[PDB]
Amino acid sequence: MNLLIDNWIPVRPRNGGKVQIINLQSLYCSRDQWRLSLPRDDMELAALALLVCIGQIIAPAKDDVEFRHRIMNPLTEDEFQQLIAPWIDMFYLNHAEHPFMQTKGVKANDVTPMEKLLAGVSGATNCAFVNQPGQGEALCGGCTAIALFNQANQAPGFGGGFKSGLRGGTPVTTFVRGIDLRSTVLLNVLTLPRLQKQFPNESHTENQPTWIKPIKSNESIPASSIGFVRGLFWQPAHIELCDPIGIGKCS
Amino acid sequence: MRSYLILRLAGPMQAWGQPTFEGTRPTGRFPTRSGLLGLLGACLGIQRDDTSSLQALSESVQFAVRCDELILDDRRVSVTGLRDYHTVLGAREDYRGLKSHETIQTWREYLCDASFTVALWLTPHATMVISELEKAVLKPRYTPYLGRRSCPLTHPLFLGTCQASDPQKALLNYEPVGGDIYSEESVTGHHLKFTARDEPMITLPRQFASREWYVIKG
């Protein structure tokens, strides 16, 4: 599944009712007003964050003029396709050599349940007692990507030798909110001048995702050398999704 | 490393020549070298036959021109063109004598909503110094104008003065930034050039010779 192309985004109309699942193009290029809809707020925050990152690498405005303008007016589908073109081969959940936020070829004695990506459902000795079971039985492609991202960002790391994210463990995330999900996502994207004022991109600084150019074991990374793409989508752990089962219901 | 003088060319209408012996008087999209030399040469009190002062000025000075786009009330305003059907009645028939045509006609092009920021500097073989130029731009002796005498300025000719290695880098300190730049001096990153016929051949009145700009896109 590919985050830029396929339908993964769980939404319901700003005003409306029945939930449906859209693709990024439908979000960026439509005056339809959307709001996220999952049964958990932390996962909605994970989602929103993911979308914001995505938009931050595909389409930063070139000035405040354009910024305001694009908030007020959706893109044309062609503009979009042109914007996402160079990035598509980086956002495949299941891929041959570069799986999204995963690491190919992981050595593990046993399979970790899906629940361990769902922050809070288990992890403490009183969880089996107070929580409903089965929530990590089988997850959507979306619920999964979103969980993956949340685990490498705002959630605490698994423990022993599982490094936490770039902002430290359990950071607070603060976003500006808009009328719809669209304008929200756009509203938390740094314009090109602010973006390069905050990150001057060198030949010295690696700007490739972690799942394309891997972190070397026990490397000592100068924080300065990490590029905004590499860091926004930083993945500090060695995770690799097992082969998917068939049709059914996101638990 | 090198000192630069920074001028601003802006007004309602602007006219910068192209080759013509006909009545159509064309305009290009940004100031000509002959034009800029003429402007400076005009602030300085340089009569037309003073071939010495002309030459002095020409071999002394070099230009790099940046095209500023207009933003109004936060909407972008492209530069547009204008054609003026311009007649003359009582025009001379010969270069000698007093016989005249009843009416002759010329078409003259102008640039609308055009604004430029120019950076000039001295060459190795200079006969002049920058503060002569600055002093003139601040207190010109002849009336200055953007191309034709019917195009005033809406902004002072003098913008500022600074120093750097590039003309580019010098231009970076004056907004708006992001415009295309045409420099007589090469800039390492950029290979594109723009053919022109700007150079005035002082030895030969009112004739011009080919040259090339270095193009630094924004």
Partner: protein
């Protein structure tokens, strides 16, 4: 004239009227040749004040009505079928002995130009297509089937000036091998150019209802022509 020195200089000359007639067409190898069967062969000459890119198809593309580029260029087409083209083109536009306009250009084309002529002709005819769309529409505004004012030529000027930025760039930098999408884009930008110019032109008169009628009709014919330009 030169500004250079020379031992001998000429100060005048002698001419007198002389007449003859050369029946037929001499195959001069420096100029393209337009062919029209009503048969009529005639060498290319600047006729209007339009931009140079409107003549490009007659300069680089063979077509057997049809067209015949200069021998020089097709020799070069055979000899170096893997080389780009940098072509000098020039001439006058005249009213008897009077020079109205002088033209000189150095067109550029990457490799594919020898074989993919049809693409070049496509581009040019697309440009002229949009031009005639705008012109037809504003003519409609002017006359009817009337506003009282002709605005179409001025608008054609504006159009042409912006086309100067658009089309040549395409011809000089396009990959003919696969060129559909660059062309598509050109079509779009031209489309919105015609919309913008139409509105800008009729804008000062649309405060009066009677003009808004004819304006609406004109706009109709405009979008008819514009939509027909989408394959």
């Amino acid at each position: 004239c030169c500004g250079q020195e020379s031992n001998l200089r000429y100060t005048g000359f002698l001419k007198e009227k002389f007449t003859f007639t050369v029946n037929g067409l001499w195959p001069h190898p420096h100029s393209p040749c337009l062919v029209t069967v009503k048969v009529e062969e005639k060498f290319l000459a600047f006729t209007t004040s339009a931009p140079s890119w409107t003549q490009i198809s007659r300069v680089v593309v063979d077509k057997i009505n049809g067209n015949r580029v200069a021998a020089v260029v097709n020799q070069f087409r055979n000899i170096a079928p893997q080389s780009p083209l940098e072509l000098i083109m020039g001439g006058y536009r005249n009213n008897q002995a009077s020079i109205l306009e002088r033209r000189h250009d150095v067109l550029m084309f990457n490799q594919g130009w020898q074989q993919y002529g049809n693409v070049i002709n496509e581009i040019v005819t697309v440009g002229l297509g949009y031009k005639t769309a705008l012109r037809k529409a504003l003519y409609t505004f002017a006359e009817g089937f009337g506003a009282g004012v002709s605005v179409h030529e001025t608008a054609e000027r504006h159009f042409y000036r912006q086309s100067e930025l658009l089309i040549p760039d395409v011809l000089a930098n396009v990959n003919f091998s696969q060129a559909d999408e660059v062309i598509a884009d050109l079509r779009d930008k031209l489309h919105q150019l015609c919309e913008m110019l139409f509105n800008q032109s009729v804008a000062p008169y649309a405060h009066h209802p009677k003009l808004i009628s004819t304006l609406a009709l004109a706009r109709a014919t405009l979008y008819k022509h514009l939509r027909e330009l989408k394959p």
